[PDB]
Amino acid sequence: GGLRRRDLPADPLTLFERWLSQACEAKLADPTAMVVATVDEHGQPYQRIVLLKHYDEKGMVFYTNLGSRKAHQIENNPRVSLLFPWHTLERQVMVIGKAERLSTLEVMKYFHSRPRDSQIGAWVSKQSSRISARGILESKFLELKQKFQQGEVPLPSFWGGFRVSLEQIEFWQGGEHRLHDRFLYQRENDAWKIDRLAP
Amino acid sequence: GGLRRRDLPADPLTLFERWLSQACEAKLADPTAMVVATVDEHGQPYQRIVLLKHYDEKGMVFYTNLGSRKAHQIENNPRVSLLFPWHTLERQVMVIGKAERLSTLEVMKYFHSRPRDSQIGAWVSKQSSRISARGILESKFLELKQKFQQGEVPLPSFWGGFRVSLEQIEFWQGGEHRLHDRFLYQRENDAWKIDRLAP
Ligand SMILES: Cc1cc2nc3c(=O)[nH]c(=O)nc-3n(C[C@H](O)[C@H](O)[C@H](O)COP(=O)(O)O)c2cc1C
Ligand SMILES: Cc1cc2nc3c(=O)[nH]c(=O)nc-3n(C[C@H](O)[C@H](O)[C@H](O)COP(=O)(O)O)c2cc1C
Ligand SMILES: Cc1ncc(COP(=O)(O)O)c(C=O)c1O
Ligand SMILES: Cc1ncc(COP(=O)(O)O)c(C=O)c1O
Ligand SMILES: Cc1ncc(COP(=O)(O)O)c(C=O)c1O
Ligand SMILES: Cc1ncc(COP(=O)(O)O)c(C=O)c1O
Secondary structure, three states: OOOOHHHOOOOHHHHHHHHHHHHHHOOOOOOOEEEEEEEOOOOOEEEEEEEOOEEEOOEEEEEEEOOOHHHHHHHHOOEEEEEEEEHHHOEEEEEEEEEEEOOHHHHHHHHOOOOHHHHHHHHHOOOOOEEOOOHHHHHHHHHHHHHOOOOOOOOOOOEEEEEEOOOEEEEEEOOHHHOOEEEEEEEEOOEEEEEEEOO | OOOOHHHOOOOHHHHHHHHHHHHHHOOOOOOOEEEEEEEOOOOOEEEEEEEOOEEEOOEEEEEEEOOOHHHHHHHHOOEEEEEEEEHHHOEEEEEEEEEEEOOHHHHHHHHOOOOHHHHHHHHHOOOOOEEOOOHHHHHHHHHHHHHOOOOOOOOOOOEEEEEEOOOEEEEEEOOHHHOOEEEEEEEEOOEEEEEEEOO
16 A cells, blocks of 8 residues: 555564565565675775575674675775665665674574585685686585584684664665655664655 | 586676576566665765666666765765676676766657656656655646646756766676685776686
């Protein structure tokens, strides 16, 4: 029926949870996939998709290789943007915030909590660096695949994650004649200020 | 079967055209939808989806309201990033370049080349500005819908477009064990330098 201000929950995460739930329900591919935009030292933005793994009032979490380009960029400029490309459901969610590193305890908890082959793969790829051949990846995977073979894959020191704070959350939902519904939740004084934005 | 360097075309657009074609062929929702990231004066990146409307060696084109936030941001920092979220087909394409304004001739040509109701809608929405109620949009739409009623909708002076140059184009294609194929085409000396990147 549309998106009216009077139906908006006070906490934007309530609305986000609802939309995420419906995305899963609709079997959209990678419902947790979001595009993370970061900015390099020259003011050049860069983008790549990562998976949302957890969220709460403190922010949205994703894991990545600490030697990657996104990691280097975040270290020089912590300001990031997240966008959930749910246009198949005529929706978009955009989050603006600062990326902060997760602690070792959190990373360990998640790391050992995933496909064994994925843990090994984390060791293999020096994410974002130029490599001369795909073969390097496959060779290392096999080599490590049996080096760790009898125990449990160790957490690589170069693997970690970030939590993006919720400074702003924007919801977009398709609208007739190109007049879409847009609401911007803006964190202010321990509260959320809501404004409709022209499409 | 995978993505090997030996099968890469010299011109990245050849590969892009192929992937775009297959995306349409697969009936993915909004095959031309791409996430455009821009950066504000504080170094804060922002994102939103727009539709690719044309592309060639000079770059990728999209249209938008010239009073919008993305437009203001581009005017302060022309460096943008484009990402085609084709993860349903285990693919991503990322473009890095500078956004340049399109001329009036180009904009007029495209503008009058689209749904009449969309032309009218372009007049209605002061894109990105805070509005107090959805009603403002609907009222104006009706008002203009009959003001232009007998002729052809005029091109709003505040409507335009941008062409993003091709400085870098990155292709990503899903790979077993989390070891994906990544190739970065980098424009150099009137030519393209190709490097595989660790996933
Ligand atoms: C559906 C999907 C999910 C992904 N999830 C992650 C993730 O959670 N963490 C990660 O580091 N890379 C992930 N990637 C790979 C990234 O898009 C990117 O290639 C990689 O992180 C390197 O980006 P960077 O060079 O900008 O640092 C994913 C790709 C797709 C298509
Ligand atoms: C599938 C899809 C296609 C869209 N295409 C465009 C477009 O071509 N031009 C445009 O201005 N906005 C488009 N939008 C709306 C934008 O995402 C965004 O709301 C708007 O441009 C304002 O962004 P801004 O406030 O950052 O300037 C589209 C949204 C979706 C979901
Ligand atoms: C898998 C992997 N990731 C990341 C890194 C390294 O980060 P850095 O760029 O400091 O070498 C390495 C480094 O040797 C590595 O093997
Ligand atoms: C605000 C806006 N402008 C333009 C477009 C698409 O371009 P066009 O209407 O010229 O096909 C969209 C598509 O969703 C849009 O939301
Ligand atoms: C539909 C629309 N778009 C854009 C603009 C304006 O751009 P500006 O922020 O300079 O007022 C207007 C301004 O009155 C408008 O009506
Ligand atoms: C490089 C990389 N790391 C992590 C993930 C997903 O997180 P996880 O493997 O812990 O489920 C992906 C998913 O595509 C990925 O490509």
